[PDB]
GROMACS .gro file of C-alpha atoms in nm:
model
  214
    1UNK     CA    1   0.000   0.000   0.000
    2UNK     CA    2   0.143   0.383  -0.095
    3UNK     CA    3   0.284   0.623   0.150
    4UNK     CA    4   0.494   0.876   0.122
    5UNK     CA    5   0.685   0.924   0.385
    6UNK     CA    6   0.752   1.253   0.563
    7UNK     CA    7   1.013   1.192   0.775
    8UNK     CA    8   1.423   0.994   0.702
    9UNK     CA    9   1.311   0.604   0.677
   10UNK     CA   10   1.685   0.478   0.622
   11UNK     CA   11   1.853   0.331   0.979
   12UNK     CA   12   2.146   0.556   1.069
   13UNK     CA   13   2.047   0.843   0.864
   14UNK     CA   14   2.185   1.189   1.028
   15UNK     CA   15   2.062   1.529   1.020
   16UNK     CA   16   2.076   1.918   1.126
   17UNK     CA   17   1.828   2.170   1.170
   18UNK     CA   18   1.929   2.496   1.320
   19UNK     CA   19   1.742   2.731   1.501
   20UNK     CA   20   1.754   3.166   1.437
   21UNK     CA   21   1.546   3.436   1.590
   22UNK     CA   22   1.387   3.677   1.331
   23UNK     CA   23   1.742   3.913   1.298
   24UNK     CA   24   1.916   3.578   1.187
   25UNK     CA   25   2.103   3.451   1.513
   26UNK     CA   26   2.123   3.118   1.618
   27UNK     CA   27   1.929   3.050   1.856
   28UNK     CA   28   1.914   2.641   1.891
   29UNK     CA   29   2.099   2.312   1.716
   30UNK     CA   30   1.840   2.030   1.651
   31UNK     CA   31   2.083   1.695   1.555
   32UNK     CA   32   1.881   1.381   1.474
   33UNK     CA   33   1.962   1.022   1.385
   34UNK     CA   34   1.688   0.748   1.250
   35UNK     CA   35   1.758   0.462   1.518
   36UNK     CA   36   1.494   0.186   1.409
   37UNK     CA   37   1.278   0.153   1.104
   38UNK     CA   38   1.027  -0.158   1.068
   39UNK     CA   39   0.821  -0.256   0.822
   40UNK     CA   40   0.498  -0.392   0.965
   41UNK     CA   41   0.193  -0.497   0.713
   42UNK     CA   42  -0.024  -0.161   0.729
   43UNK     CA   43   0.289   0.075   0.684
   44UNK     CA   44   0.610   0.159   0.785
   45UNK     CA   45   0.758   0.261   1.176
   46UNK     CA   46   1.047   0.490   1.190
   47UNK     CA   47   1.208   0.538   1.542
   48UNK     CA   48   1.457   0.847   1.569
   49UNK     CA   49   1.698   1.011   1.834
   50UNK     CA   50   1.745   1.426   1.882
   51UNK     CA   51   1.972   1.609   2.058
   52UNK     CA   52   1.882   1.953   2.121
   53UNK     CA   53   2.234   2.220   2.191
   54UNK     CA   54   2.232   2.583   2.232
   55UNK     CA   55   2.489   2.705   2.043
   56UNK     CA   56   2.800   2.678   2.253
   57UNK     CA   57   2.692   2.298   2.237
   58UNK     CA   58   2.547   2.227   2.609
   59UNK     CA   59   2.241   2.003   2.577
   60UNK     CA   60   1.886   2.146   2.646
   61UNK     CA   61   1.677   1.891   2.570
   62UNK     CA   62   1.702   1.485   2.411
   63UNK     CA   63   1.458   1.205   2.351
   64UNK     CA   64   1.342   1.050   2.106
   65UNK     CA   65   1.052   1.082   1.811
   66UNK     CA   66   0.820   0.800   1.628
   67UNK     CA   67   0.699   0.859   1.249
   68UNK     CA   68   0.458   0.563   1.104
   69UNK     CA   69   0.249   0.515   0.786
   70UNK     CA   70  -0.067   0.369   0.860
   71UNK     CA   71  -0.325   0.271   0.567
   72UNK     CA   72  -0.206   0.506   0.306
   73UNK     CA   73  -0.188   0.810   0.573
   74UNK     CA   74   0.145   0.974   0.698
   75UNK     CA   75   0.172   1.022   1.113
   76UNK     CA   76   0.450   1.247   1.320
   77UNK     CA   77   0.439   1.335   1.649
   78UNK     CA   78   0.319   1.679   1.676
   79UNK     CA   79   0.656   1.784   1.914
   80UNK     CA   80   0.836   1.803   1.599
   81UNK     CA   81   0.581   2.111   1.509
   82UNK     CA   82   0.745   2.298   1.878
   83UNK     CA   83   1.116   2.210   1.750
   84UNK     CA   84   1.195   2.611   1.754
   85UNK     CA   85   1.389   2.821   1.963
   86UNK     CA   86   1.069   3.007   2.139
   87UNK     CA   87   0.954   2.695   2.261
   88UNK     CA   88   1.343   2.467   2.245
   89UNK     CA   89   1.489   2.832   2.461
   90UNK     CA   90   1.255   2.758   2.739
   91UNK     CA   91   1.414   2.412   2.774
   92UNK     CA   92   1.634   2.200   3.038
   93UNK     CA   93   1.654   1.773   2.984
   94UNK     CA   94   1.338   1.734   3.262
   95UNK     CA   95   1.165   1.937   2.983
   96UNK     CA   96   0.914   1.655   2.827
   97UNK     CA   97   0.580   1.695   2.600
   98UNK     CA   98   0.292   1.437   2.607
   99UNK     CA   99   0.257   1.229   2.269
  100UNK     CA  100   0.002   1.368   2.029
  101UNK     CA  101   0.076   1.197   1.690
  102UNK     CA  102  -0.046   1.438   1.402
  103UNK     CA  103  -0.138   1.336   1.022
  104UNK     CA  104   0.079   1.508   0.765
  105UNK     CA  105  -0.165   1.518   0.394
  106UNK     CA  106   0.069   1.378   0.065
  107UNK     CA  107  -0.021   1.694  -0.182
  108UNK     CA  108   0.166   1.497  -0.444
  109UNK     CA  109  -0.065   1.199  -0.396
  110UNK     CA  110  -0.352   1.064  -0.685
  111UNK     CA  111  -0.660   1.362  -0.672
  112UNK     CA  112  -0.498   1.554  -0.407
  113UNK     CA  113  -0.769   1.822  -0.311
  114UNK     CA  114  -0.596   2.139  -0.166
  115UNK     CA  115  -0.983   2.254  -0.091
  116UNK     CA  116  -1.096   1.971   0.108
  117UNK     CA  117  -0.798   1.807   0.332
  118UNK     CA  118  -0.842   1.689   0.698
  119UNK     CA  119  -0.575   1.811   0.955
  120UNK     CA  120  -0.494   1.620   1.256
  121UNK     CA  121  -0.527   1.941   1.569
  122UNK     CA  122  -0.302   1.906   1.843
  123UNK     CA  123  -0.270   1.998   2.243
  124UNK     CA  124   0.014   1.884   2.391
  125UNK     CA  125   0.144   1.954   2.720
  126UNK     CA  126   0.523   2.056   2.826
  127UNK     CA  127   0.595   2.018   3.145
  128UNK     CA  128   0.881   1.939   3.418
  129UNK     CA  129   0.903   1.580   3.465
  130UNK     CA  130   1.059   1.614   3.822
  131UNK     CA  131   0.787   1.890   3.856
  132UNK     CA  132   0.465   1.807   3.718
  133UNK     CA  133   0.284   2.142   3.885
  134UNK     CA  134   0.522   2.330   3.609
  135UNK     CA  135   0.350   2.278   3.298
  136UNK     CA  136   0.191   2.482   2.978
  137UNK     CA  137  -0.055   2.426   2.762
  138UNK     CA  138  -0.001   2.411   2.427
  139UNK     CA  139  -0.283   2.412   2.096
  140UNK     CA  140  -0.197   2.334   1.735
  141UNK     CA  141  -0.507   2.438   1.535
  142UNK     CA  142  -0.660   2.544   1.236
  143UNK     CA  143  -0.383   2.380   1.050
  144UNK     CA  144  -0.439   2.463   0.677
  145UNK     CA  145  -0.230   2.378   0.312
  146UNK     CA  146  -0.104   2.630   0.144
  147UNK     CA  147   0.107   2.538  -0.135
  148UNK     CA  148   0.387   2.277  -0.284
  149UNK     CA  149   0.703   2.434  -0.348
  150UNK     CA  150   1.045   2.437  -0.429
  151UNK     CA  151   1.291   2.554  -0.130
  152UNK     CA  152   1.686   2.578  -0.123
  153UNK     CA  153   1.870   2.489   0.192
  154UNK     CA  154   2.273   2.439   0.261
  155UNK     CA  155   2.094   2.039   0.295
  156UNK     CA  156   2.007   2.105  -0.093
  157UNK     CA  157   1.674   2.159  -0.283
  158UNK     CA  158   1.381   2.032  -0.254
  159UNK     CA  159   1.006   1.997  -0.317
  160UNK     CA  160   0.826   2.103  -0.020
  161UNK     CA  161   0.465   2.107   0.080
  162UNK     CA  162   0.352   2.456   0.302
  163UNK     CA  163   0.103   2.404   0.559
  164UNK     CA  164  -0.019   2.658   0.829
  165UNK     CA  165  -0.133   2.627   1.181
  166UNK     CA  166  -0.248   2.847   1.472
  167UNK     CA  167  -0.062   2.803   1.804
  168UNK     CA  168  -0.219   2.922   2.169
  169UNK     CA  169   0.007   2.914   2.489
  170UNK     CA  170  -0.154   2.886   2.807
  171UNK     CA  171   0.051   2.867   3.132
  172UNK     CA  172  -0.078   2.849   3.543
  173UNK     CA  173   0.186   3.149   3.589
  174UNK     CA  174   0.075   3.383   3.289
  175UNK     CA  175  -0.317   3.554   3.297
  176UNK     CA  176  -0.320   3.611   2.930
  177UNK     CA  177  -0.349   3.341   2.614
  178UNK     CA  178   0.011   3.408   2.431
  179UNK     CA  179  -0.159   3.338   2.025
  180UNK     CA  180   0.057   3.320   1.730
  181UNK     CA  181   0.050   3.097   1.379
  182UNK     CA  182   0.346   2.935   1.180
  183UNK     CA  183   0.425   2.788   0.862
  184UNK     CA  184   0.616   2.439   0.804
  185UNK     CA  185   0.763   2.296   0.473
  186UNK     CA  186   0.841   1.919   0.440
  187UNK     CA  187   0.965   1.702   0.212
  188UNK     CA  188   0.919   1.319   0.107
  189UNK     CA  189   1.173   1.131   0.299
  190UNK     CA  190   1.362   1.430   0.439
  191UNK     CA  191   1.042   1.541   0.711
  192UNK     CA  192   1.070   1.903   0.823
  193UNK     CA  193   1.277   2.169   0.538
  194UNK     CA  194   1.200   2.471   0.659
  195UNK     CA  195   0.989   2.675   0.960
  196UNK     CA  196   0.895   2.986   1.006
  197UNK     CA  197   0.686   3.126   1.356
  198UNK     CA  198   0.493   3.441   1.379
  199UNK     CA  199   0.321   3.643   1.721
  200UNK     CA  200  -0.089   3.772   1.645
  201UNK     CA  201   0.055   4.084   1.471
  202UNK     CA  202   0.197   3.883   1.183
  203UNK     CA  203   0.591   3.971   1.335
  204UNK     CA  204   0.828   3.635   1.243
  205UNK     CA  205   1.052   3.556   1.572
  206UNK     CA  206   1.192   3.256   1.424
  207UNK     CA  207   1.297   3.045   1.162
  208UNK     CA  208   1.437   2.656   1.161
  209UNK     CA  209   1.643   2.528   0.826
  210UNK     CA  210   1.808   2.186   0.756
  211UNK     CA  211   2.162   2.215   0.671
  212UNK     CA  212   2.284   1.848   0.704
  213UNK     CA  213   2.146   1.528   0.565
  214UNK     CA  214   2.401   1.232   0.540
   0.00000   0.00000   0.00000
């Protein structure tokens, strides 16, 4: 059964994404590794290790991340959407975000309709593991394609799908919603290209780009 798949499906395969603020420092270096991939009879499982370094190279945050096709249909977990320095800044190792796996729509796919396509939404949670009383909430909605197309990184070129979302940040400390929206390109077999992040009055404060894939 066909799936493209949004995400690296080859065991051992490496890759950078860096982090900037909206001026063009960096902010944040996002290293991954695939660790497992398994073919199972409905689709495909891929199992993959981050680090997450500021960049003087002390670790803020590592786990792990699970990518699966599932009937036809392309799943991530929906932590990968937060991988930016806004969120990746406010971040120690006892920094953890409940699992929320999101679909990811093929554009390239037979009768693709860019009018009517069903998004996954997401609310996750980050929170302290040692401290479970320090936690925010956080809403992926409203998620919306754009278009498909081409974007240049120091990784290469390649054919990208654009798809929107709104975010909402609640938090026990804070009295006010923090609201903002975002834009994500990914690519078959590569995963996440390019980010961009943007506060209510349409202001980018960050960007995420691959540079490595080996």
């Amino acid at each position: 059964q066909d799936c493209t798949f949004f995400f690296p499906q080859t065991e051992g395969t490496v890759w950078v994404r860096k982090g900037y603020d909206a001026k063009g420092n960096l902010q944040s270096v996002m290293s991954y590794q695939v660790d497992e991939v398994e073919t199972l009879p409905s689709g495909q499982e891929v199992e993959a290790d981050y680090v997450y370094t500021n960049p003087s190279g002390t670790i803020v945050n590592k786990g792990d991340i699970k990518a699966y096709c599932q009937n036809g249909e392309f799943f991530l977990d929906s932590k990968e959407t937060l991988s930016y320095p806004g969120v990746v800044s406010e971040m120690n190792t006892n920094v953890d975000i409940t699992e929320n796996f999101i679909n990811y729509p093929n554009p390239y796919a037979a009768n693709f309709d860019k009018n009517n396509v069903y998004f996954d939404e997401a609310s996750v949670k980050i929170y302290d593991k040692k401290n479970r009383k320090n936690r925010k909430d956080m809403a992926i909605k409203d998620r919306e394609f754009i278009k498909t197309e081409s974007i240049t990184t120091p990784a290469g070129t390649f054919d990208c799908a654009k798809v929107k979302y709104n975010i909402a940040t609640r938090s026990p400390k804070s009295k006010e919603t923090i609201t903002g929206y975002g834009y994500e390109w990914y690519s078959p077999n590569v995963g996440l290209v390019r980010t961009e992040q943007y506060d209510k009055n349409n202001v980018l404060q960050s960007y995420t780009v691959l540079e490595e894939l080996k």
